[PDB]
């Protein structure tokens, strides 16, 4: 369990945005699109996300970057799919 | 009610505010036990069905 979030509050200053970011990440884990970045102790996604914040390997910057990259990861897949839609003309 | 042996002394904070720490001797002797009589009702009504 995570008794105090002070360390996470150290990694990202705002402390509300801590809740938001850790939330978003915890969601990334809870509805599984992804896996933890650090060993799961049986800790629920709620705490795993916080452990990820405390280790400084997860925050708003990192998440935004990863997501932005994944958009192009899908664009690459559907590259030949959507260009086949030239029937639009 | 019922009288009984009482000792005044803090016991491991289990008595903390007004809280009362009672032995098993009491629950075993069934002295503070109470009997409740509840009246439950069943109604047979008339519906258009």
């Amino acid at each position: 369990a995570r008794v105090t979030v002070q360390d996470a509050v150290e990694k990202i200053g705002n402390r509300f945005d801590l809740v938001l970011v850790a939330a978003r990440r915890a969601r990334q884990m809870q509805v599984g699109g992804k896996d933890p970045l650090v060993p799961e102790e049986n800790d629920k996604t709620t705490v795993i996300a916080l452990r990820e914040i405390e280790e400084g390997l997860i925050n708003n910057q990192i998440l935004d970057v990863r997501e932005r990259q994944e958009q192009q990861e899908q664009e690459a897949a559907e590259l030949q799919a959507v260009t086949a839609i030239a029937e639009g003309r | 009610g019922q009288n009984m042996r009482v000792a005044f002394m803090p016991w491991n904070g289990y008595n903390f505010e007004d809280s009362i720490l009672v032995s098993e001797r009491v629950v075993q002797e069934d002295r503070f036990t109470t009997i409740h009589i509840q009246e439950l009702a069943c109604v047979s009504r008339d519906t258009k069905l």
């Binding site: 402390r15 809870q30 509805v31 | -």
Partner: protein
């Protein structure tokens, strides 16, 4: 007393015990202020929308809770929704602007 999902009041949809299965605790103005003092917006929203007053949000929530997804799709509380009709029932036109 403990309650998860019970019956609901007809006139305004709100948790109400009909079975001797008790209506949930009442979350008042002061408790709301207590939430406002902290930074918890979502706790408050879920408190007065999905857990109580939203006829949609409650069930749509329940399905997610059992599905293993914790989220909410809040919508508009039925209270305010009724207030709109009561106000509009008078000579007062109340509308919701923009987008």
């Amino acid at each position: 007393h403990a309650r998860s999902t019970g019956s609901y009041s007809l006139v305004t949809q709100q948790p109400l015990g009909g079975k001797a299965q008790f209506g949930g605790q009442r979350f008042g103005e002061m408790e709301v202020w207590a939430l406002e003092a902290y930074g918890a917006a979502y706790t408050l929203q879920e408190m007065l929308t999905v857990k109580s007053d939203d006829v949609n949000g409650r069930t749509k929530m329940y399905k997610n809770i059992v599905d293993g997804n914790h989220q909410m799709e809040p919508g508009m509380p039925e209270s305010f929704n009724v207030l709109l009709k009561e106000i509009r029932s008078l000579g007062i036109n109340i509308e919701l602007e923009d987008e």
